[PDB]
Short mmCIF file of N, CA and C (backbone and C1' of nucleotides) in Angstrom, two decimals:
data_model
loop_
_atom_site.label_atom_id
_atom_site.label_comp_id
_atom_site.label_asym_id
_atom_site.label_seq_id
_atom_site.Cartn_x
_atom_site.Cartn_y
_atom_site.Cartn_z
N UNK J 1 -48.25 -11.26 -216.27
CA UNK J 1 -47.55 -10.54 -217.72
C UNK J 1 -48.11 -9.10 -217.97
N UNK J 2 -49.12 -8.49 -217.46
CA UNK J 2 -49.10 -6.99 -217.09
C UNK J 2 -47.85 -6.45 -215.96
N UNK J 3 -47.67 -8.04 -214.80
CA UNK J 3 -46.42 -7.19 -214.19
C UNK J 3 -45.33 -7.39 -214.70
N UNK J 4 -44.89 -8.17 -215.63
CA UNK J 4 -43.35 -8.49 -216.11
C UNK J 4 -43.75 -7.09 -216.98
N UNK J 5 -44.86 -6.16 -217.58
CA UNK J 5 -44.53 -5.59 -218.79
C UNK J 5 -44.61 -4.38 -217.82
N UNK J 6 -44.65 -4.15 -216.62
CA UNK J 6 -44.44 -3.00 -215.62
C UNK J 6 -42.74 -3.73 -214.77
N UNK J 7 -42.42 -4.62 -214.92
CA UNK J 7 -40.63 -4.78 -215.18
C UNK J 7 -40.29 -3.75 -215.08
N UNK J 8 -40.55 -3.23 -216.30
CA UNK J 8 -39.21 -2.66 -217.04
C UNK J 8 -38.51 -2.87 -218.09
N UNK J 9 -37.34 -2.64 -218.61
CA UNK J 9 -36.78 -3.05 -219.29
C UNK J 9 -35.14 -3.25 -217.99
N UNK J 10 -34.71 -2.31 -217.66
CA UNK J 10 -33.82 -2.96 -216.38
C UNK J 10 -34.12 -3.84 -215.83
N UNK J 11 -35.30 -4.01 -215.06
CA UNK J 11 -35.06 -5.51 -214.40
C UNK J 11 -35.24 -6.50 -214.80
N UNK J 12 -36.26 -6.71 -216.06
CA UNK J 12 -36.13 -8.23 -216.59
C UNK J 12 -34.90 -8.35 -217.00
N UNK J 13 -34.18 -7.44 -217.56
CA UNK J 13 -33.33 -7.78 -218.18
C UNK J 13 -32.30 -8.47 -217.07
N UNK J 14 -32.12 -8.18 -215.49
CA UNK J 14 -31.64 -8.75 -214.73
C UNK J 14 -32.45 -10.00 -214.19
N UNK J 15 -33.69 -9.66 -214.79
CA UNK J 15 -33.99 -11.27 -214.24
C UNK J 15 -33.26 -12.51 -215.72
N UNK J 16 -33.56 -11.86 -216.87
CA UNK J 16 -33.06 -13.20 -217.66
C UNK J 16 -31.75 -13.47 -217.29
N UNK J 17 -30.77 -12.64 -216.76
CA UNK J 17 -29.20 -12.37 -216.53
C UNK J 17 -29.60 -14.11 -215.29
N UNK J 18 -30.36 -13.56 -214.14
CA UNK J 18 -30.23 -14.32 -213.29
C UNK J 18 -30.81 -16.22 -213.81
N UNK J 19 -32.06 -16.07 -214.78
CA UNK J 19 -32.46 -17.33 -214.88
C UNK J 19 -31.02 -17.49 -215.27
N UNK J 20 -30.29 -17.51 -216.69
CA UNK J 20 -29.37 -18.35 -217.17
C UNK J 20 -29.83 -17.90 -218.81
N UNK J 21 -30.43 -16.95 -218.78
CA UNK J 21 -30.90 -17.41 -220.18
C UNK J 21 -29.58 -16.25 -220.81
N UNK J 22 -29.55 -17.04 -222.40
CA UNK J 22 -28.59 -16.39 -223.25
C UNK J 22 -28.10 -14.76 -223.76
N UNK J 23 -26.87 -14.77 -223.74
CA UNK J 23 -26.51 -12.90 -223.74
C UNK J 23 -27.04 -12.39 -224.90
N UNK J 24 -27.26 -13.17 -225.34
CA UNK J 24 -27.85 -12.38 -227.43
C UNK J 24 -29.00 -12.33 -227.35
N UNK J 25 -29.89 -12.96 -226.69
CA UNK J 25 -31.42 -12.68 -225.95
C UNK J 25 -31.22 -11.17 -224.74
N UNK J 26 -30.73 -11.36 -224.28
CA UNK J 26 -30.46 -10.27 -223.08
C UNK J 26 -30.06 -9.24 -223.44
N UNK J 27 -29.30 -9.21 -224.99
CA UNK J 27 -28.59 -7.78 -225.74
C UNK J 27 -29.47 -7.54 -226.18
N UNK J 28 -30.44 -7.56 -227.17
CA UNK J 28 -31.14 -7.28 -228.48
C UNK J 28 -31.91 -6.06 -227.35
N UNK J 29 -31.61 -5.76 -226.58
CA UNK J 29 -32.25 -4.78 -226.04
C UNK J 29 -33.44 -4.89 -226.10
N UNK J 30 -34.57 -5.76 -226.05
CA UNK J 30 -35.90 -5.58 -226.56
C UNK J 30 -36.71 -5.58 -225.66
N UNK J 31 -37.42 -4.83 -224.78
CA UNK J 31 -38.53 -4.87 -223.53
C UNK J 31 -39.10 -6.11 -223.83
N UNK J 32 -40.21 -6.17 -225.12
CA UNK J 32 -41.32 -6.39 -225.26
C UNK J 32 -41.25 -7.90 -226.11
N UNK J 33 -40.29 -7.81 -226.56
CA UNK J 33 -39.20 -9.67 -226.79
C UNK J 33 -38.41 -9.88 -225.81
N UNK J 34 -38.16 -9.02 -224.53
CA UNK J 34 -37.14 -9.73 -223.45
C UNK J 34 -38.74 -10.82 -222.49
N UNK J 35 -39.70 -9.83 -222.57
CA UNK J 35 -40.59 -9.82 -221.66
C UNK J 35 -41.62 -11.57 -221.97
N UNK J 36 -41.62 -11.74 -223.24
CA UNK J 36 -41.84 -13.23 -223.49
C UNK J 36 -41.12 -13.96 -223.27
N UNK J 37 -39.94 -13.88 -223.72
CA UNK J 37 -38.97 -14.93 -222.92
C UNK J 37 -38.81 -14.98 -221.92
N UNK J 38 -39.08 -14.20 -220.63
CA UNK J 38 -38.71 -14.56 -219.61
C UNK J 38 -40.17 -15.06 -219.58
N UNK J 39 -41.53 -14.61 -219.52
CA UNK J 39 -42.68 -15.51 -219.10
C UNK J 39 -42.53 -16.98 -220.02
N UNK J 40 -41.85 -17.12 -220.84
CA UNK J 40 -42.03 -18.63 -221.39
C UNK J 40 -40.67 -19.70 -219.60
N UNK J 41 -39.82 -18.51 -220.15
CA UNK J 41 -38.68 -19.13 -218.81
C UNK J 41 -39.57 -19.23 -217.59
N UNK J 42 -40.36 -18.73 -217.29
CA UNK J 42 -40.91 -18.68 -215.85
C UNK J 42 -41.69 -20.09 -215.78
N UNK J 43 -42.24 -20.26 -216.98
CA UNK J 43 -43.70 -21.34 -217.15
C UNK J 43 -42.73 -22.94 -217.15
N UNK J 44 -41.34 -22.38 -218.15
CA UNK J 44 -40.43 -23.87 -217.78
C UNK J 44 -40.22 -24.16 -216.18
P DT E 1 -34.68 19.23 -219.66
"O5'" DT E 1 -37.13 18.10 -219.67
"C5'" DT E 1 -37.53 18.83 -219.77
"C4'" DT E 1 -38.07 19.11 -221.01
"C3'" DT E 1 -38.97 18.94 -221.54
"O3'" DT E 1 -39.94 19.25 -222.12
"C1'" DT E 1 -37.25 19.82 -223.24
P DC E 2 -41.37 17.25 -221.55
"O5'" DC E 2 -41.09 17.35 -223.67
"C5'" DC E 2 -41.77 17.43 -224.53
"C4'" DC E 2 -41.29 18.43 -225.34
"C3'" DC E 2 -41.82 16.97 -227.01
"O3'" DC E 2 -41.58 17.85 -227.62
"C1'" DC E 2 -39.69 16.15 -226.34
P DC E 3 -42.80 18.68 -228.96
"O5'" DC E 3 -42.24 17.18 -230.54
"C5'" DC E 3 -41.87 16.19 -230.35
"C4'" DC E 3 -42.34 15.00 -230.72
"C3'" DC E 3 -43.61 14.64 -230.98
"O3'" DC E 3 -44.56 14.42 -231.79
"C1'" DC E 3 -42.41 13.37 -230.08
P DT E 4 -46.03 14.59 -232.00
"O5'" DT E 4 -46.44 13.39 -231.90
"C5'" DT E 4 -46.62 12.42 -232.59
"C4'" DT E 4 -45.49 11.97 -233.27
"C3'" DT E 4 -46.19 10.16 -233.78
"O3'" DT E 4 -45.26 10.25 -234.86
"C1'" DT E 4 -44.89 9.42 -231.98
P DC E 5 -45.64 8.30 -236.26
"O5'" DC E 5 -44.65 7.52 -235.44
"C5'" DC E 5 -43.29 7.33 -235.12
"C4'" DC E 5 -43.13 5.67 -235.14
"C3'" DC E 5 -43.78 4.89 -235.22
"O3'" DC E 5 -42.88 3.35 -235.91
"C1'" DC E 5 -43.66 4.64 -233.59
P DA E 6 -43.22 2.58 -236.51
"O5'" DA E 6 -43.03 1.46 -236.24
"C5'" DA E 6 -41.66 0.68 -236.01
"C4'" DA E 6 -41.62 -0.76 -234.39
"C3'" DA E 6 -42.06 -2.06 -235.11
"O3'" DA E 6 -41.50 -2.50 -234.17
"C1'" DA E 6 -43.16 -0.47 -232.70
P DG E 7 -41.97 -4.29 -234.89
"O5'" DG E 7 -42.56 -5.47 -233.36
"C5'" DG E 7 -40.87 -5.06 -232.08
"C4'" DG E 7 -41.95 -5.72 -231.29
"C3'" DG E 7 -42.81 -6.76 -230.95
"O3'" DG E 7 -42.44 -7.69 -230.31
"C1'" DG E 7 -44.00 -4.55 -230.19
P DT E 8 -43.43 -8.99 -229.77
"O5'" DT E 8 -44.66 -8.37 -229.07
"C5'" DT E 8 -44.18 -7.67 -227.72
"C4'" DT E 8 -45.16 -7.78 -226.60
"C3'" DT E 8 -46.38 -8.76 -227.13
"O3'" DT E 8 -46.82 -8.94 -224.87
"C1'" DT E 8 -47.17 -6.94 -227.57
P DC E 9 -47.49 -10.17 -224.80
"O5'" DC E 9 -48.70 -9.25 -224.00
"C5'" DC E 9 -48.79 -9.33 -222.56
"C4'" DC E 9 -50.01 -8.47 -221.96
"C3'" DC E 9 -50.97 -8.74 -221.76
"O3'" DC E 9 -51.69 -8.77 -220.70
"C1'" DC E 9 -51.28 -7.46 -223.29
P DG E 10 -52.59 -9.74 -219.98
"O5'" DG E 10 -54.03 -8.92 -220.06
"C5'" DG E 10 -54.10 -7.51 -219.44
"C4'" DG E 10 -55.68 -7.23 -220.40
"C3'" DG E 10 -56.90 -8.48 -220.00
"O3'" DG E 10 -57.94 -7.83 -219.20
"C1'" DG E 10 -56.81 -8.19 -222.61
P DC E 11 -59.54 -9.09 -219.23
"O5'" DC E 11 -60.74 -8.29 -220.25
"C5'" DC E 11 -60.62 -6.98 -220.46
"C4'" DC E 11 -61.46 -7.44 -221.82
"C3'" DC E 11 -62.69 -8.00 -221.71
"O3'" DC E 11 -64.16 -7.33 -222.63
"C1'" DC E 11 -61.37 -8.36 -223.57
P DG E 12 -65.61 -8.29 -221.74
"O5'" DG E 12 -66.07 -8.02 -223.67
"C5'" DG E 12 -66.41 -7.11 -224.20
"C4'" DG E 12 -67.34 -7.38 -225.72
"C3'" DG E 12 -67.40 -8.55 -226.24
"O3'" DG E 12 -68.73 -8.07 -227.00
"C1'" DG E 12 -65.39 -8.45 -226.99
P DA E 13 -68.42 -7.32 -229.11
"O5'" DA E 13 -68.49 -8.49 -229.47
"C5'" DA E 13 -67.67 -7.91 -230.52
"C4'" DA E 13 -67.52 -9.19 -231.24
"C3'" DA E 13 -68.75 -10.20 -230.96
"O3'" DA E 13 -68.93 -10.58 -232.66
"C1'" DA E 13 -66.65 -11.48 -230.74
P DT E 14 -69.98 -11.16 -233.29
"O5'" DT E 14 -69.80 -12.46 -234.39
"C5'" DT E 14 -69.46 -12.27 -235.41
"C4'" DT E 14 -68.35 -13.50 -235.57
"C3'" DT E 14 -69.38 -14.49 -236.32
"O3'" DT E 14 -68.25 -15.47 -236.57
"C1'" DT E 14 -67.26 -14.70 -234.27
P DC E 15 -68.81 -16.58 -237.45
"O5'" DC E 15 -67.69 -17.09 -238.83
"C5'" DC E 15 -66.52 -17.11 -237.43
"C4'" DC E 15 -66.10 -18.58 -237.42
"C3'" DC E 15 -67.21 -19.75 -237.84
"O3'" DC E 15 -66.40 -21.11 -238.73
"C1'" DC E 15 -66.72 -20.02 -235.41
P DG E 16 -66.86 -21.56 -239.76
"O5'" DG E 16 -66.34 -23.06 -238.89
"C5'" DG E 16 -64.80 -23.17 -238.71
"C4'" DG E 16 -64.02 -24.19 -238.24
"C3'" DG E 16 -65.23 -25.34 -237.98
"O3'" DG E 16 -64.25 -26.55 -237.49
"C1'" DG E 16 -65.75 -24.77 -235.87
P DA E 17 -64.48 -28.20 -238.49
"O5'" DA E 17 -64.12 -29.12 -237.04
"C5'" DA E 17 -63.35 -28.89 -235.97
"C4'" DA E 17 -63.43 -29.44 -235.03
"C3'" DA E 17 -64.42 -30.58 -235.01
"O3'" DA E 17 -63.60 -31.79 -234.25
"C1'" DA E 17 -65.62 -29.20 -233.06
P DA E 18 -64.66 -33.28 -233.64
"O5'" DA E 18 -65.45 -33.63 -232.62
"C5'" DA E 18 -64.69 -33.35 -231.49
"C4'" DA E 18 -66.11 -33.08 -230.49
"C3'" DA E 18 -66.51 -33.69 -230.45
"O3'" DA E 18 -66.55 -33.68 -228.75
"C1'" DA E 18 -68.25 -31.96 -230.35
P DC E 19 -67.39 -35.34 -228.30
"O5'" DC E 19 -68.15 -35.19 -227.27
"C5'" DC E 19 -68.25 -33.81 -225.90
"C4'" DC E 19 -70.17 -33.41 -226.06
"C3'" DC E 19 -71.14 -34.79 -225.95
"O3'" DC E 19 -71.53 -34.83 -224.41
"C1'" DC E 19 -71.99 -33.40 -227.34
P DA E 20 -72.07 -35.98 -223.55
"O5'" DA E 20 -73.91 -35.44 -223.54
"C5'" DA E 20 -74.15 -34.40 -223.03
"C4'" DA E 20 -75.69 -34.19 -223.61
"C3'" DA E 20 -76.78 -35.42 -222.87
"O3'" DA E 20 -77.96 -34.22 -222.68
"C1'" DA E 20 -76.72 -33.85 -225.48
P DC E 21 -79.16 -35.52 -222.00
"O5'" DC E 21 -80.36 -34.85 -223.33
"C5'" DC E 21 -81.05 -34.12 -223.20
"C4'" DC E 21 -81.82 -34.29 -223.94
"C3'" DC E 21 -82.81 -35.09 -224.75
"O3'" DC E 21 -84.26 -34.61 -224.80
"C1'" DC E 21 -81.72 -34.90 -226.61
P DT E 22 -85.13 -36.00 -224.51
"O5'" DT E 22 -85.80 -35.48 -226.33
"C5'" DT E 22 -85.96 -34.72 -227.24
"C4'" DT E 22 -86.05 -35.03 -228.63
"C3'" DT E 22 -87.35 -36.36 -228.69
"O3'" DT E 22 -87.67 -35.82 -230.28
"C1'" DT E 22 -85.57 -36.97 -229.66
P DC E 23 -89.36 -36.49 -229.43
"O5'" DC E 23 -89.39 -36.45 -231.24
"C5'" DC E 23 -88.90 -36.67 -232.30
"C4'" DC E 23 -88.54 -37.88 -233.45
"C3'" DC E 23 -89.75 -38.96 -233.45
"O3'" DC E 23 -90.09 -39.54 -234.30
"C1'" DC E 23 -88.03 -40.05 -233.13
P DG E 24 -91.39 -39.51 -234.18
"O5'" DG E 24 -91.55 -40.87 -235.51
"C5'" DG E 24 -91.16 -40.27 -236.70
"C4'" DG E 24 -89.94 -41.58 -237.09
"C3'" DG E 24 -90.46 -42.94 -237.46
"O3'" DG E 24 -90.07 -43.40 -238.86
"C1'" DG E 24 -88.72 -43.39 -236.25
P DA E 25 -91.09 -44.49 -239.47
"O5'" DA E 25 -90.11 -45.43 -240.10
"C5'" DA E 25 -88.83 -44.72 -239.94
"C4'" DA E 25 -87.90 -45.90 -240.69
"C3'" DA E 25 -88.40 -47.42 -240.77
"O3'" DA E 25 -87.58 -47.75 -241.64
"C1'" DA E 25 -87.05 -47.67 -238.58
P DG E 26 -87.40 -48.91 -242.63
"O5'" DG E 26 -87.29 -50.45 -241.41
"C5'" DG E 26 -85.78 -50.28 -241.49
"C4'" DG E 26 -85.89 -51.42 -240.02
"C3'" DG E 26 -86.45 -52.85 -240.79
"O3'" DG E 26 -85.67 -53.65 -240.62
"C1'" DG E 26 -87.07 -52.49 -238.16
P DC E 27 -85.90 -55.42 -240.81
"O5'" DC E 27 -85.91 -56.40 -239.88
"C5'" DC E 27 -84.24 -56.28 -239.07
"C4'" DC E 27 -84.88 -56.30 -238.01
"C3'" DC E 27 -85.33 -57.47 -236.94
"O3'" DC E 27 -84.29 -58.71 -236.48
"C1'" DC E 27 -86.08 -56.27 -236.32
P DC E 28 -84.60 -59.96 -236.56
"O5'" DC E 28 -84.59 -60.53 -235.01
"C5'" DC E 28 -83.99 -60.18 -234.00
"C4'" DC E 28 -84.67 -59.59 -233.00
"C3'" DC E 28 -85.55 -61.08 -232.73
"O3'" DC E 28 -85.27 -62.01 -231.86
"C1'" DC E 28 -86.80 -59.80 -232.30
P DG E 29 -85.57 -63.50 -231.52
"O5'" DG E 29 -86.51 -63.70 -229.85
"C5'" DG E 29 -85.82 -63.11 -228.89
"C4'" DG E 29 -87.50 -62.74 -227.81
"C3'" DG E 29 -88.41 -63.96 -227.90
"O3'" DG E 29 -88.24 -64.30 -226.74
"C1'" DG E 29 -89.40 -62.04 -228.97
P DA E 30 -88.96 -65.80 -225.84
"O5'" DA E 30 -90.43 -64.97 -225.60
"C5'" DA E 30 -90.90 -64.27 -224.98
"C4'" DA E 30 -92.10 -63.33 -224.57
"C3'" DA E 30 -93.42 -64.68 -224.23
"O3'" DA E 30 -93.70 -63.97 -223.69
"C1'" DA E 30 -93.89 -63.35 -226.01
P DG E 31 -94.88 -65.07 -222.81
"O5'" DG E 31 -96.74 -65.07 -223.24
"C5'" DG E 31 -96.57 -63.75 -223.74
"C4'" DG E 31 -97.89 -63.69 -224.35
"C3'" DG E 31 -98.65 -65.41 -224.50
"O3'" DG E 31 -100.60 -64.15 -224.27
"C1'" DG E 31 -98.35 -64.30 -226.96
P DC E 32 -101.09 -65.50 -223.86
"O5'" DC E 32 -103.10 -65.46 -224.79
"C5'" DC E 32 -103.62 -64.25 -225.45
"C4'" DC E 32 -103.52 -64.80 -226.70
"C3'" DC E 32 -103.92 -65.81 -226.34
"O3'" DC E 32 -105.13 -65.55 -227.17
"C1'" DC E 32 -102.49 -66.14 -228.77
P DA E 33 -106.40 -66.24 -226.60
"O5'" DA E 33 -107.57 -67.14 -228.74
"C5'" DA E 33 -107.95 -65.61 -229.32
"C4'" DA E 33 -108.01 -66.63 -230.76
"C3'" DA E 33 -108.28 -67.93 -230.42
"O3'" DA E 33 -109.62 -67.46 -232.41
"C1'" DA E 33 -105.71 -67.83 -232.13
P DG E 34 -110.28 -68.77 -232.09
"O5'" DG E 34 -109.64 -69.62 -233.35
"C5'" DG E 34 -108.72 -68.82 -234.07
"C4'" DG E 34 -108.66 -70.06 -235.34
"C3'" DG E 34 -108.38 -71.31 -235.38
"O3'" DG E 34 -108.81 -71.75 -236.93
"C1'" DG E 34 -106.19 -70.75 -235.21
P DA E 35 -110.28 -72.38 -237.61
"O5'" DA E 35 -109.31 -73.20 -238.53
"C5'" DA E 35 -108.30 -72.27 -239.58
"C4'" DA E 35 -107.16 -73.03 -240.28
"C3'" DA E 35 -107.10 -74.63 -240.76
"O3'" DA E 35 -106.43 -75.04 -241.89
"C1'" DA E 35 -105.69 -74.69 -238.88
P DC E 36 -107.34 -76.42 -242.58
"O5'" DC E 36 -105.45 -76.48 -242.69
"C5'" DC E 36 -104.38 -76.53 -242.54
"C4'" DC E 36 -103.47 -77.76 -242.30
"C3'" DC E 36 -104.52 -79.44 -242.67
"O3'" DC E 36 -103.50 -79.91 -243.19
"C1'" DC E 36 -103.72 -79.40 -240.78
P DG E 37 -104.25 -81.43 -243.83
"O5'" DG E 37 -104.42 -82.11 -243.11
"C5'" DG E 37 -103.19 -83.59 -243.06
"C4'" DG E 37 -102.98 -83.49 -241.70
"C3'" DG E 37 -103.21 -85.37 -240.91
"O3'" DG E 37 -101.88 -85.99 -241.92
"C1'" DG E 37 -102.47 -82.86 -239.60
P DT E 38 -102.97 -88.11 -241.68
"O5'" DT E 38 -102.46 -88.58 -239.60
"C5'" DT E 38 -101.22 -88.28 -240.10
"C4'" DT E 38 -100.66 -88.61 -238.47
"C3'" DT E 38 -100.98 -89.76 -237.85
"O3'" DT E 38 -100.34 -90.22 -236.55
"C1'" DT E 38 -102.00 -88.14 -236.16
P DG E 39 -99.59 -91.36 -237.03
"O5'" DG E 39 -100.21 -92.31 -235.35
"C5'" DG E 39 -100.87 -92.80 -235.01
"C4'" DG E 39 -101.74 -92.57 -233.28
"C3'" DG E 39 -102.65 -93.54 -232.70
"O3'" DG E 39 -102.27 -93.41 -231.30
"C1'" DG E 39 -103.85 -91.05 -232.80
P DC E 40 -102.75 -94.42 -230.40
"O5'" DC E 40 -104.57 -93.98 -230.01
"C5'" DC E 40 -104.26 -92.77 -228.68
"C4'" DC E 40 -106.01 -92.52 -228.66
"C3'" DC E 40 -106.72 -94.12 -228.36
"O3'" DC E 40 -107.11 -93.68 -227.14
"C1'" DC E 40 -107.61 -92.94 -229.83
P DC E 41 -107.86 -95.45 -226.50
"O5'" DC E 41 -109.95 -94.60 -226.35
"C5'" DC E 41 -110.48 -94.14 -225.83
"C4'" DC E 41 -111.92 -93.43 -226.60
"C3'" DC E 41 -113.00 -94.16 -226.50
"O3'" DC E 41 -113.84 -93.94 -225.70
"C1'" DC E 41 -112.35 -93.29 -228.14
P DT E 42 -115.16 -94.28 -225.45
"O5'" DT E 42 -115.86 -94.28 -225.93
"C5'" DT E 42 -117.77 -94.35 -226.06
"C4'" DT E 42 -118.57 -94.10 -227.65
"C3'" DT E 42 -119.68 -94.82 -227.72
"O3'" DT E 42 -120.78 -93.39 -227.50
"C1'" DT E 42 -118.29 -94.19 -229.21
P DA E 43 -122.15 -93.96 -227.70
"O5'" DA E 43 -122.51 -93.31 -229.28
"C5'" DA E 43 -124.19 -93.18 -229.21
"C4'" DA E 43 -124.81 -93.51 -231.17
"C3'" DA E 43 -125.52 -94.38 -231.39
"O3'" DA E 43 -125.61 -93.58 -232.45
"C1'" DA E 43 -123.76 -94.87 -231.76
P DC E 44 -127.25 -94.15 -233.02
"O5'" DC E 44 -127.20 -95.05 -234.11
"C5'" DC E 44 -126.83 -94.22 -235.46
"C4'" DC E 44 -126.33 -95.62 -236.52
"C3'" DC E 44 -127.16 -96.55 -236.81
"O3'" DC E 44 -127.08 -96.81 -238.03
"C1'" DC E 44 -125.35 -98.03 -236.23
P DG E 45 -127.88 -97.38 -239.28
"O5'" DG E 45 -127.79 -98.88 -239.73
"C5'" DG E 45 -126.86 -98.87 -240.64
"C4'" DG E 45 -126.38 -100.21 -241.15
"C3'" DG E 45 -126.74 -101.38 -241.53
"O3'" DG E 45 -126.58 -101.74 -242.50
"C1'" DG E 45 -125.63 -102.19 -239.37
#
DNA sequence: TCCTCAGTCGCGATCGAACACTCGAGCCGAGCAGACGTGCCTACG
């Protein structure tokens, strides 16, 4: 979680692109929301 | 060049739900002494 916070908007965006997250969530460009989704995607 | 601002992480902090221990109330079985009767046997007329 702290590691995901360090990940920064640029690399978490690229990770959400890699997992196949839809472009709306990538688009909102909210780092805090993006990390919560990426943590959920990793948990899945 | 800034300049605070919104969304979220880690940790103490208390709180509700559950779980382990205790303790007595009550019932049940065993055990023992005894009474309330039937049958089975002897000293006295």
